[PDB]
């Protein structure tokens, strides 16, 4: 107890040694509360002053037998040292070791080391340190030497138990301290500095609580082993498929037909170095670094007249994009899985191979980039849930008085507070009215309004500060926040362009009465509160990665600059200084790494950049995901416990609401009082007949069939409809017949159900609206108004007739019902998110309004230097001097708050954001020519917005989606919410498959040789040998590459033939041994099918390659050898369980995919009818457009992931010359103009990406529920 406190004297050491000797002559865990580095229990009480920080005897009985001694500090921290003399020199009773102990366990020592570490970390941010910094580095290494010497003198070096070298974290200190001196007395600067970076990792040891965070991070990884194996296996299989399909295709180029001087493609190719002369023989698009890709099929890209597609040269993107070897294809498949710039590769592969190969990208996107990511997230979330549950499981176990009272009475809760809330809302609306092209009258009005609002807020501050006491005034946090905002507003009134925007923070005062805004506030507070150490670890890791990148590749960027820039100057993203290196690290964490990786590999080498980038990806993504999960679960379950009532103290808004309920009702009642003072079976048979007809299955099948036919007839109406005259006439008359049929169906339903039940049904309402629009269009066409503008606009509404299929299919109906039940909470979170994004939009308008204009040379689109033409007036003077000069603005900017909302959407999705950020960091002023990185540190605006308005906003949305969807599942009894009843029965039947007990063993045949074969094929060695053979075959096909010799091809063919023979022999042996009992196993059936597939595919591929000419069929048929590799799943158990989970998820995913397909079909019809004639620029070109149904669905599958939606929206934002031509003539059509409709385009794209986000979130939750149910059962 508290009296168990004695000094460690020589008598105690002698007694301990005597006990040890007695134990030896004769020849258990310590208390976790008494373990080293833990707080002393309160049961021991305080420590007398005479023995704090002194050598004391051991308290834990476990070490009471061994030679140990402990020392306690002034904060009750326990340190366990070793009683054996340090290096056999310093005894515990020596004054020198006593002083060393006193130094080691002390707050000031740790504080000094921490300040030294932070100062050093600040110093490693300079890429060109001055000469005087060498003295500072010497001081740093001297401080580290002193600290290490103190530790070694106190604890002893390595011999003992509790010694200096036993701690893993002291190994880092020793390595750093030997490296410093070795580098000093050994004379690559980059390597030495990158090793100096190791001192930044000492923060974990000095800052309390960081070691626990690192340990939890390491623990979360070890549960990912099976998911990593499955990810590697799936990526390898898809990489092999892509290697078989697309080998050498990205080398297709358009080579000119006419060559002078008896030249040849072979002779030309070895005399070409620069791009200038490569442009003289191959076709290049203007301002492109790569030659235009082409194909040999009809659905591939075409070459201009005078060129022929040929396979020659290098691959695009410095040669780093290809399917030529397994390693490059694996890089491409990892890029697809992470979805980094994947639409560029997707478009290149479609151009080089054909549009028919988008099936590959659909399958790969779904299987990898959705399912594997789901698995990673689910496993990490399960790990963190388990650790959190364990943590909470162990945790539980005179005149002044008069008028100040009058002023206090003046501040009335239901009136003054409501007035302040209204004033805050009005001030926000007033600030949201600013725009760039603003008159002086509007500017003056806004200025006086802001002055009035600031005066009102200051007056309220003063009234509260003199009503209540100033000491009482500063006791509530909201009052401190109000005070800070008021004084900052006054400071700005006395005088930047950003200090004006800090009054926007008053919006958060609405969180006292807005529970959902308070939830976001609590999440943000947790990020720096209970989860402050995890955020600190994330920041330290980002800092370390930034400085490592700068030290490794910073000088290479400057030295090799003309390999990645024609102007021989630094690019936008580089590592030459610390800020740009941090920007690259942050962009990688946002999900964009391959484009900067290409530049890194060009300046510094493939291996180093590959290693560094993958380390950054893995570690940073793991830490960010752990922070996301911690925030989510803490602010979801831990914070919300209903400890207090709903606004326990009567909310002033609620009091005002009650007072309104009193007053308005009383006044209305009194006004009413004053007003009163002043003053046939045959029809039933017809109904039942219609009911019988409508309800029948044949009627429903007929109507479904005609819905499908009418929906599919819309796809035929494209820009080529004038070539198909007969189809056009047939479709017109088919539209007439469909209108008639659906009108008849509506009449039948009217008679069968009655007006009441029909018009209280929502599906019937939708069908009624569709048929009304169709009938109005038909009657207008037949009457004669077929050319009126409104009539044509209404005729564009035939794209919504596929909506009649929602009520006819059960799966889409169930998914739609789930979404409709989820809508309400989504609305509240949407309101919170819109207010949060409005704050950032107003700030961006204050920063960047009217500053993105620039003078450009329209021939090459190059911005003029600011030396010449620094103004707008100089730009106009030059436009009179020169013809191809324009003072042009960005389409997506911060000129007003709606355009700012569009900009923030492009930044949040990371699609189109770079153009906005370049314009922002180049900005100078209004009517001033931009200058390169003039406003360099406006990147902080975008980083802060990304963090707060994407990470925290998505945290809030996911946290409410979880609760809402859990309640949705709870209310109906725990049943699946994305499955139909028949699908539920099939789901249970499938569930009984994976939960089978072991079956009856196969009995051995009676024959001797058959029995020997039986005991040979039923052994484990046989199975492991088959598995290693399968791995060898995988390696054999991983060997294949583009341009390999004929000898390579022949030997690979014969090795694969030998593998086929061996596998067929295994099948024959199993058939002979097991007999017809061999077919009672599903895996045996799969192997038998695989063997047949192998033999037949080999023979058929040989037949095609010998007696036929069809490379495409050859590759598709040779895709059949993949089956021999898919048998590796049989040996692996964890990946087998994960694939069973995918099979379990299949039905709900099918329903959600049906709904997604219908939505994308409707949007494709609308896009064909709207954007089929816009200018081909940005993301719209000769292959990716809205000219046909197939092209439109190609474009819409791409932006379901949101990839490249900004480049598709950009050509639609052209609405007037010189951007477009309203009188453009299109041969073969009567349509005129190539302009867009910006409102229609913005609505189209924003609505589609929002709907895609919601549906894909549904798929995420389905897969996660499947994993959580399967893995925890």
């Amino acid at each position: 107890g508290p009296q168990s406190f004695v000094h460690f004297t020589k008598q105690s050491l002698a007694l301990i040694e005597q006990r040890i000797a007695e134990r030896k002559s004769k020849e258990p865990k310590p208390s976790s509360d008494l373990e080293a580095g833990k707080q002393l229990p309160f049961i021991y009480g305080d420590i007398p002053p005479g023995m704090v920080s002194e050598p004391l005897e051991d308290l834990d009985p476990y070490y009471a037998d061994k030679k140990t001694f402990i020392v306690l500090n002034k904060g009750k921290t326990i340190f366990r040292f070793n009683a054996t003399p340090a290096l056999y020199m310093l005894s515990p009773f020596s004054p020198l070791r006593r002083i060393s102990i006193k130094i080691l366990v002390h707050s000031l020592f740790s504080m000094l080391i921490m300040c030294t570490i932070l100062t050093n970390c600040i110093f490693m941010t300079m890429n060109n340190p001055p000469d005087w910094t060498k003295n500072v580095e010497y001081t740093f290494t001297g401080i580290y030497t002193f600290e290490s010497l103190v530790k070694i003198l106190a604890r002893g070096f390595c011999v003992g138990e509790f010694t200096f070298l036993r701690d893993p974290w002291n190994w880092l200190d020793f390595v750093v301290i030997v490296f410093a001196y070795l580098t000093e007395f050994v004379n690559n600067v980059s390597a030495l500095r990158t090793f100096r970076v190791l001192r930044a990792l000492k923060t974990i040891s000095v800052i309390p609580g960081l070691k626990t965070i690192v340990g939890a991070l390491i623990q979360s990884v070890k549960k990912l082993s099976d998911v990593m194996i499955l990810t590697v296996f799936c990526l390898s299989v898809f990489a092999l498929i892509g290697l078989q399909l697309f080998m050498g295709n990205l080398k297709h180029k358009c080579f000119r037909n006419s060559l002078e001087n008896n030249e040849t493609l072979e002779s030309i190719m070895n005399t070409l170095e620069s791009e200038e002369d490569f442009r003289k023989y191959f076709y290049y698009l203007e301002g492109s670094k790569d030659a235009l890709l082409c194909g040999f099929s009809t659905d591939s890209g075409q070459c201009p007249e005078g060129y022929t597609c040929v396979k020659i040269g290098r691959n695009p993107d410095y040669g780093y994009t290809s399917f030529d070897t397994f390693s490059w294809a694996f890089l491409a498949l990892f890029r697809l899985m992470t979805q980094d710039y994947w639409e560029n590769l997707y478009q290149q592969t479609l151009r080089a191979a054909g549009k028919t190969y988008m099936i590959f990208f659909v399958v790969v996107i779904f299987l990898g980039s959705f399912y594997l990511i789901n698995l990673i997230l689910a496993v990490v979330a399960m790990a963190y849930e388990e650790q959190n549950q364990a943590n909470i499981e162990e945790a539980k176990q005179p005149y002044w008085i008069k008028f100040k009272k009058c002023i206090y009475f003046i501040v009335m809760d239901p009136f003054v507070d409501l007035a302040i809330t209204i004033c805050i809302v009005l001030n926000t609306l007033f600030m949201a009215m600013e725009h760039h092209p603003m008159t002086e009258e509007f500017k003056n009005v806004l200025a006086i309004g802001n002055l009035v609002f600031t005066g009102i807020f200051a007056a309220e501050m003063v009234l509260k500060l003199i009503a209540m006491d100033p000491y009482e005034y500063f006791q509530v946090g909201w009052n401190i926040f109000d005070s800070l905002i008021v004084t900052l507003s006054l400071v700005e009134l006395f005088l930047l362009s950003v200090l004006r925007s800090f009054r926007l923070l008053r919006v958060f005062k609405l969180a006292k009465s807005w529970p959902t805004l308070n939830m976001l506030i609590k999440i943000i507070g947790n990020s720096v509160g209970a989860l402050g150490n995890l955020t600190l670890v994330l920041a330290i890791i980002v800092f370390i990665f930034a400085v490592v990148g700068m030290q490794l590749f910073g000088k290479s960027y400057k030295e090799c600059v003309c390999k990645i820039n024609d102007d021989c100057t630094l690019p936008r993203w580089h590592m030459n200084d610390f800020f740009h290196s941090f920007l690259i690290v942050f962009r990688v964490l946002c999900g964009e790494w391959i484009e900067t990786m290409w530049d890194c590999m060009e300046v510094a080498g493939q291996a180093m950049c590959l290693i560094v980038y993958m380390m950054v990806m893995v570690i940073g993504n793991l830490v960010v995901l752990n922070l996301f999960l911690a925030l989510l679960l803490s602010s979801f379950s831990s914070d919300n416990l209903t400890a207090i009532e709903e606004d326990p103290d009567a909310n002033n808004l609620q009091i005002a609401v009650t007072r309104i309920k009193k007053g308005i009702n009383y006044v209305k009642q009194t006004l009413r009082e004053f007003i009163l003072k002043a003053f046939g079976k045959i029809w039933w048979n017809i109904r039942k007949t219609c009911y019988k007809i409508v309800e029948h299955s044949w009627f429903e099948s007929f109507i479904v069939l005609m819905i499908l036919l009418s929906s599919g007839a819309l796809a035929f109406e494209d820009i080529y409809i004038e070539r198909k005259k007969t189809i056009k006439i047939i479709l017109e008359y088919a539209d007439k017949i469909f209108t008639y049929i659906f009108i008849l169906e509506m009449l039948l339903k009217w008679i069968a159900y009655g007006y009441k039940t029909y018009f209280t049904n929502a599906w019937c309402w939708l069908d009624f609206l569709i048929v009304d629009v169709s009938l109005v269009t038909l009657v207008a066409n037949t009457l004669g108004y077929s050319d009126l503008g409104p009539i044509k606009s209404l005729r564009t509404l035939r794209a919504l007739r596929p909506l009649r299929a929602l009520s006819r299919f059960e799966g889409m109906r169930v998914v739609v019902n789930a979404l409709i039940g989820a809508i309400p909470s989504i609305m509240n979170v949407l309101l919170v998110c819109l207010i949060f994004w409005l704050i950032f939009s107003i700030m961006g308008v204050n920063l960047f309004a009217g500053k993105f204009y620039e003078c450009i040379n329209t021939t090459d689109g190059s911005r003029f230097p600011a030396s010449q033409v620094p103004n707008r007036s100089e730009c106009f003077a030059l436009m009179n001097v020169s013809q191809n000069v324009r003072w042009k603005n960005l389409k997506v900017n911060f000129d007003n708050v709606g355009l700012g909302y569009l900009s923030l959407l492009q930044v949040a999705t990371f699609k189109g954001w770079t153009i906005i950020m370049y314009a922002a960091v180049d900005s100078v002023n209004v009517d001033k020519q931009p200058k390169y990185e003039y406003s360099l540190y406006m990147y902080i605006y975008f980083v802060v917005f990304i963090i707060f308005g994407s990470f925290f906003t998505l945290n809030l949305f996911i946290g409410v989606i979880i609760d809402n969807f859990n309640q949705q599942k709870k209310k109906l009894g725990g049943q699946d919410i994305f499955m139909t009843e028949e699908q539920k029965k099939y789901y249970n039947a499938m569930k009984k498959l994976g939960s089978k007990k072991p079956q009856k063993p196969i009995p051995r045949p009676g024959n001797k040789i058959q029995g020997c074969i039986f005991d040979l094929v039923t052994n484990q060695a046989f199975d492991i040998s088959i598995m290693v053979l399968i791995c060898l075959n995988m390696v054999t096909m991983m060997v294949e590459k583009e341009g390999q010799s004929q000898h390579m091809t022949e030997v690979l063919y014969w090795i694969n033939v030998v593998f086929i023979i061996l596998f067929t022999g295994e099948c024959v042996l199993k058939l002979i041994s097991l007999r017809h009992y061999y077919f009672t196993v599903g895996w045996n059936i799969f192997d038998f099918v695989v063997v047949i597939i192998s033999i037949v595919g080999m023979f058929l591929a040989d037949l095609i390659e010998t007696y036929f000419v069809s490379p495409t069929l050859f590759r598709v048929i040779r895709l059949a050898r993949i089956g021999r590799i898919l048998r590796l799943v049989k040996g692996a158990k964890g990946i087998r369980t994960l694939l069973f989970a995918l099979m379990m998820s299949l039905p709900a995913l099918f329903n959600i995919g049906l709904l997604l397909f219908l939505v994308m079909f409707i949007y494709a019809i609308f896009g064909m009818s709207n954007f089929a004639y816009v200018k081909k620029e940005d993301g719209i070109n000769d292959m990716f457009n809205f000219e046909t149904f197939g092209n439109s669905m190609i474009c819409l599958f791409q932006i379901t992931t949101s990839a490249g939606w900004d480049g598709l929206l950009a050509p639609i934002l052209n609405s007037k010359p010189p951007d477009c031509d309203p009188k453009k003539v299109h041969p073969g059509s009567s349509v005129e103009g190539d302009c867009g409709n910006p409102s229609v385009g913005i609505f189209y794209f924003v609505s589609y990406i929002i709907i895609s986000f919601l549906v894909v979130v549904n798929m995420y939750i389905a897969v996660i529920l499947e994993n959580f149910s399967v893995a925890t059962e």
Binding site: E273, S556, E559, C560, C562, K563, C568, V603
Partner: protein, 119 residues
């Protein structure tokens, strides 16, 4: 571009003197645009004499003071523009330098070797 040359070289009279001039430029040396100049000055402020040069190939000006004792002993592709001097004479003592221009690098290289002849 870091040009690595010996500050001072001592070579016995009557023997050969290799003059190591090396540079590191991160771009490949192509012989169409790479420029190499080798001067000889009796002193720091003395006049410089063109004796060896590279424009597309090794160009030997064959100065009368050196007779025919100057040869190229390097490889421009391997960043080796070292020259050599057969049968060094006492008059060969002086200051030798190698200017290097390797496009597309902006900077121009510069080296200096103080060849000294002892008995």
């Amino acid at each position: 571009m870091e040009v690595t040359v010996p500050a001072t070289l001592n070579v016995l009279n009557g023997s050969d003197a290799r003059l190591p001039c090396t540079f590191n430029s991160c771009y490949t040396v192509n012989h169409k645009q790479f420029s190499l100049n080798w001067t000889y000055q009796e002193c720091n402020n003395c006049s410089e004499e063109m004796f060896l040069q590279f424009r597309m190939k090794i160009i030997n000006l064959k100065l009368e003071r050196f007779q025919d004792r100057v040869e190229f002993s390097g490889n421009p592709s391997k960043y080796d523009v070292s020259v050599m001097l057969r049968n060094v004479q006492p008059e060969d003592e002086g200051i030798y330098n190698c200017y290097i221009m390797n496009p597309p690098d902006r900077h121009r290289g510069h080296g200096k070797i103080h060849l000294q002849v002892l008995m």
